[PDB]
Each structure stands twice: as C-alpha cells, then as structure tokens.
Amino acid sequence: GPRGSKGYCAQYRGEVCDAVLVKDSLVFFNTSYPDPEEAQELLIHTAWNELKAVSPLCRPAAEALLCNHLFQECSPGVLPTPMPICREYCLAVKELFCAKEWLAMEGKTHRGLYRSGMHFLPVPECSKLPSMHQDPTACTRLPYLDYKTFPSI
Amino acid sequence: KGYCAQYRGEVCDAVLVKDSLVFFNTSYPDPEEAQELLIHTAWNELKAVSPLCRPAAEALLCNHLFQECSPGVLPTPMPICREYCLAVKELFCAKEWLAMEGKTHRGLYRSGMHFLPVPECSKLPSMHQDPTACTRLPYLD
Ligand SMILES: *[C@@H]1O[C@H](CO)[C@@H](O[C@@H]2O[C@H](CO)[C@@H](O)[C@H](O)[C@H]2NC(C)=O)[C@H](O)[C@H]1NC(C)=O
Ligand SMILES: *[C@@H]1O[C@H](CO)[C@@H](O[C@@H]2O[C@H](CO)[C@@H](O)[C@H](O)[C@H]2NC(C)=O)[C@H](O)[C@H]1NC(C)=O
C-alpha cells in the first residue's frame, strides 16, 4: 500500500483485531513510532485486557472502536491516509453501548483516569470527528458487533 | 558533568538497557541516591496510571533519569530516541501522560528536588538517523 513520510498502509498482521478489520483492507501504521505494527499490537492487547472489566454490552463495541481507531483503514490515494472513526460511531459507543463506563464517568475523572471506567483508553474525542452524513466515505462506520439488553435510537 | 557506571539501584533494574553503563550527575553530592530518589518519587504517580501507560511511562522515566552512556572510555550520556519518546507520551500514555507529568514535576518542585524534565520528543534525534546515537527503550525493544 501507499508509503510516505509519516507512515504507511499495509494489511493487518495481528490476531486481536482480526474479526473486526476487513480481511484484505489496508490500515495505517504510524512511523513516528518504532516498529509501529508491533507497538500498535502491544497496545491493543493491553487495551483489550482492560476491557474485561467493562459490562457485556459495552465490551464488543469498545473492542471494535479501539480496533478501528488504532488501526485506521486507509482511503484510496497515492498518500497513506488514515480514515478516522465517524462521529456517530464514536457517540454510539460513548453514549449507548458504554454509557455507564464512558458518558457517565465524565466529570468524575478527577478520581483518576484509570479509576474512571474507560477514560484512560486511547479512544477519540467524538466532537473532533467527522460525520457519517457529511461524507459517508471519509470515515469508518460502526461495524457488525458479535454478541454471543440493547440500547435503542 | 558526571560519570558512567553500572546501575546499583533497586527501581530500574529490568527497565534499563542490558549490560550498559548509565550516567550519574555529579552536580549532586550523592548522584546514585539522588537519581534513585527521583525515580522513587516518580513511582508515586506511576502507581496511579493504567497498565496501558504504566510500563511505557516507567521505561521512559528510568532511561531518562539514568541516561545510557555511549561506548568508550570517555563516554557521553545518550538522548532517548525520538520515536520511543513519542510512542510513550502519545501512544501508550495518550490520555494520561501530561497529567502524570504535571503531577510528578510539581511534586519534585514542592520538595525542592533538582531534576531535569523529560525532553520534548521533537527535540530528540531519530532512531533511523544513527541507531547508535540514541537510546531504544527495552519495553518496546
Ligand atoms: C502519528 O503519531 C504522531 C506522534 O504521536 C501524531 O502526532 C501527534 O498528534 C497528536 C494528536 O493526537 C497531537 O496532540 C500531537 O501534537 C502530535 N505530535 C507530534 C509530535 O506531532 C500523529 O497524529 C499520528 N498520526 C496519525 C494519523 O494518527
Ligand atoms: C546535572 O544536573 C543539574 C542539576 O539538576 C543540571 O543543571 C540544570 O540544567 C538545566 C538545563 O535546562 C537548567 O535549567 C538548571 O538551571 C540547572 N540546574 C542547576 C541548579 O544547575 C544539569 O543539566 C545536569 N547535567 C546533565 C548532563 O544531565
């Protein structure tokens, strides 16, 4: 895939995010970091282990969000260009699936980010993300979540 | 302004580069105790950060406070490689780093303890520039 000054696009080679990421898709690896494929994989491992603490509703949504956010699909082009999470995807997880662990813990983060549910996790700030309805191709949408009760919109 | 020797402390054993010598700043009357005390004080805040950040943050703090010395009989303290600094501050500790750094810096200032702050990562050299010119944190290898 495309390579450039700040990173490159390549197929995912790990096992944690295997079921979430599109099989043949290219994802962005950030060469600001050393051996980014290894570093990103070590991070997602540790992130997923922390998600054993969250509710059964929240878990698959947060897992998918962390995967789509830490391994961002590359949009077509000659440059390596990561697609951010759609705002609606972010807000869904924040306000619906993980409401108790994320939205509710806002303003209670003074007790410690690690002691505040989910706020220590490398999740994006949903306000700073583009919309599904501004350009549905410019961001990653909420994928199929495997649950094996539900928030309503 | 100091000497290079084997790390003789308790905190940073697994965290420093294997079989390397590290830098002791002789601006302190007891550099090995003073630098040991700095990482001890840092651990008060390390306690409080998540296991996503904690091992990365410790690696950075230990290797910063106990700089790896270059090879040779007149060795020099190496900087941390830019990439490793960025991975720690902005990947592994993306949410928690600045708050932990604020708290650690201020606890040191309150105590009247002399210290160097972790550098701005962008001011550091790349690992690709010259692999022998900067420290690669063992946590990330
Ligand atoms: C690749 O990594 C770099 C370094 O961490 C990122 O640049 C930082 O972006 C954050 C936003 O999360 C800013 O707050 C920092 O000021 C930036 N740091 C530097 C040194 O520029 C960059 O965003 C990453 N690229 C992608 C596409 O995620
Ligand atoms: C050895 O330690 C001393 C004291 O902590 C360092 O001196 C400080 O250096 C910074 C440079 O940014 C200055 O802002 C301070 O004024 C200095 N403090 C004092 C009281 O002298 C010195 O840089 C260290 N040397 C090395 C090579 O690490």
Swiss-Prot record, chain B:
The lineage of its organism: Eukaryota, Metazoa, Chordata, Craniata, Vertebrata. Receptor tyrosine kinase which plays a central role in the formation and the maintenance of the neuromuscular junction (NMJ), the synapse between the motor neuron and the skeletal muscle. Recruitment of AGRIN by LRP4 to the MUSK signaling complex induces phosphorylation and activation of MUSK, the kinase of the complex. Ubiquitinated by PDZRN3. Ubiquitination promotes endocytosis and lysosomal degradation. Phosphorylated. Phosphorylation is induced by AGRIN in a LRP4-dependent manner. Autophosphorylated. Induction: Up-regulated upon denervation (at protein level). This is Muscle, skeletal receptor tyrosine protein kinase. Belongs to the protein kinase superfamily. Tyr protein kinase family. Disulfide bonds join 4-69, 12-62, 53-93, 81-134, 85-121. Residues 1-137 form the FZ domain. It comes from the Eukaryota. It is found in: Postsynaptic cell membrane. Muscle specific. Monomer. Homodimer. Interacts with LRP4; the heterodimer forms an AGRIN receptor complex that binds AGRIN resulting in activation of MUSK. Forms a heterotetramer composed of 2 DOK7 and 2 MUSK molecules which facilitates MUSK trans-autophosphorylation on tyrosine residue and activation. Interacts (via cytoplasmic part) with DOK7 (via IRS-type PTB domain); requires MUSK phosphorylation. Interacts with DVL1 (via DEP domain); the interaction is direct and mediates the formation of a DVL1, MUSK and PAK1 ternary complex involved in AChR clustering. Glycans are attached at residue 25.
